[PDB]
């Protein structure tokens, strides 16, 4: 079954991996260096053993495709995965005049009263971002973020260069290119981002007319984390093609510190009794052919069946 | 035995590559996306069944330790490995006024006679280079080089920064840390390099004591280039950790487009025939504690024994 590697490389983890611990003070079981192979012809890899948000996966990817770092756009969407990072900058700010939000994210697994005021903070927060255009333009715009680094690297002269622009554009002048490369990683933004990219960078590649991409991560949480990163790049590796008039080749995913926190081990335990069963089917809007252009209706998951879904701290 | 991941890889193009074209006329067999694992504790892995100038990658991982890009230096160590990107330079500017150039490297290899001018004329450009300053400054310096990449990344704010320096002093004080990358591949400087990096980026990890590291090489010729690499980056995580006070961990290297030119084939079959040795152990000087300062004598190969040296075509 194709989502096997996933499995095994929890398996491993559990196996082979050695105590380490990390940033967030919890504990987490190590290996370094990993590779796995999708063959993105046979199937959709998005998990089966466990229900996994598909639309989120859909509608982050637009956004970075893009070029955009406004939050707006989720909260547009109903994703949330980005929230923390602007609300906390909203939080440090002269204007957040509310009560106490120092540490929130992880004050909140264990709240005096906490959880309720975070979780209605942020009501507040999101709300006015989707409707104050000005506070929205202030708070929302996370700055620094994937669809700017793919889509608009500011250059030493004050310019912007549209990496993933460019790959595509060459991939169809010069498929068989061995530089066909995005890279998300720099060396001045990092030494002072709150989380520098974990995608730190991929490389595309073509032959017998088969399109194929190679992420390269340097550290994923298994159980919360590898699984959205597997579906977010098989889809941009099958979006791209499409506008490229190219078959699906493979998705290959290179790890720098695979990891597995040890408050996840009882529930990657629970996924691994699990048995997989068919993998879903893509299917991309036949008209629309520049996937800049594609809206969240132009993007479907046929016969998708999956396990319910596991639960899990997360580790700030 | 150590060096067999490589044989394995070799005899692996062999079988599942599949032909594909390239930038240099020449066709190549490929296969996109692979990873090999060298455990630095059971010996250095400098091939035995084919001899490796290893005075050479010594000179020149050097001389990117020393943060430097002029050329000067390998001359001054017998190095030849950059002579043509400075030389071609050379020719295309309004001093060179020789004889005919254009196309050198190729020409050389049906030579009407052009080898010996071509020869030649680098023994008069390379001496300049080595005696007159000012020409050495003009000619010599070939710019953007893993050195300055490592060592001197130009910011957007007119500034430099010393990328290598600081993952070595970040390894120190937080041995642990996920984010230990040096990145030799920047978005705007690719677009008009006349070789963008084939050695992207590296990714430092401790645990357990011991130093690890995971090169991603976009492009390697597996016959003549993917030998030295193993070296050059083997022996940077041995230098490292001395500084460090680390163990010595594993060497991981993941490819991108692994290839075997065709005019290779030959040669390669010739070195599967053989039956590696035992690896030489690295030897490197207790006193001297800051790599920075490390110089040719600092650093010994005891016990290689290998296999005579293959010889094969360059295609450019
Ligand atoms: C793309 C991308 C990766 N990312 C980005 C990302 C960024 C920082 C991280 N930090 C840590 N500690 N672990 C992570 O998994 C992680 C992941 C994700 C972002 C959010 C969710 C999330 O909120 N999870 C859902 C549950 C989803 C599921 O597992 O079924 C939730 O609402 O609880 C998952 C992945
Ligand atoms: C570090 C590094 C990699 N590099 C850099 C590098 C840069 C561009 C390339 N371009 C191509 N076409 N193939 C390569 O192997 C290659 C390698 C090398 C540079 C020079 C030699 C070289 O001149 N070879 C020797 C023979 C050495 C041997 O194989 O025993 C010679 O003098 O013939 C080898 C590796
Ligand atoms: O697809 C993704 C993206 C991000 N992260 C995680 C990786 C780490 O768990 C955490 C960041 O810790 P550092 O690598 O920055 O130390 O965010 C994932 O797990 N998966
Ligand atoms: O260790 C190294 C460094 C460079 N190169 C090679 C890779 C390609 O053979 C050639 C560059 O072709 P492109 O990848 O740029 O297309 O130089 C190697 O083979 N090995």
């Known amino acids: 079954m194709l989502e096997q590697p996933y499995l095994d490389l929890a398996k491993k983890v559990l196996d082979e991996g050695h105590f380490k611990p ?8 190590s290996i370094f260096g990993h ?6 012809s046979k199937g959709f890899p998005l998990l089966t053993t466990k229900k996994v948000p598909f639309g989120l996966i859909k509608s982050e990817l637009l956004w970075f495709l893009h070029g955009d770092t406004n939050i707006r756009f989720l909260l547009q969407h109903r994703n949330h ?14 204007e957040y005049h509310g009560p106490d939000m120092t540490d929130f994210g992880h004050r909140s697994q264990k709240d005096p009263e906490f ?3 975070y979780h209605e903070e942020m009501a507040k927060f999101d709300d006015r971002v989707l409707h ?13 973020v994937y669809g700017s680094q793919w889509r608009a690297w500011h250059t030493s002269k004050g310019d912007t260069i549209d990496q993933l622009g460019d790959v595509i554009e060459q991939i169809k002048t010069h498929p068989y290119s061995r530089r066909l490369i995005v890279s998300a990683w720099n060396p001045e933004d990092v030494p002072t981002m ?3 990219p974990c995608h730190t960078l991929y490389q595309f590649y073509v032959n017998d007319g088969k399109l194929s991409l190679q992420l390269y991560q340097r550290s994923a949480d298994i159980f919360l984390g590898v699984p959205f990163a597997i579906a977010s790049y098989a889809l941009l ?14 998705f290959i995913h290179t790890f720098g ?4 926190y040890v408050n996840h081990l009882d529930q990657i335990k629970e996924q691994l009794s699990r048995t997989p069963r068919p993998a879903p089917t893509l299917q991309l809007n036949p008209d629309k052919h520049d996937i800049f252009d594609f809206d969240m209706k132009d993007i479907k998951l046929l016969n998708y069946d999956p396990y319910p879904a596991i639960k899990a701290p997360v580790a700030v």
């Open 257 to 260: 510190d695979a990891h597995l």
């Open 194 to 196: 709150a989380l520098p």
């Open 81 to 94: 995965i980005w929230d923390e990072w602007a609300f906390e900058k909203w939080v440090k700010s002269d």
């Open 22 to 29: 990390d940033r967030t003070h919890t504990g987490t079981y």
């Open 35 to 40: 590779q796995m192979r999708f063959d993105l």
């Open 237 to 250: 590796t099958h979006l791209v093609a499409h506008e490229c008039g190219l078959e699906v080749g493979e």
């Open 115 to 117: 959880a309720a005021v």
């Open 132 to 144: 104050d255009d000005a506070f929205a333009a202030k708070y929302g715009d996370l700055g620094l």
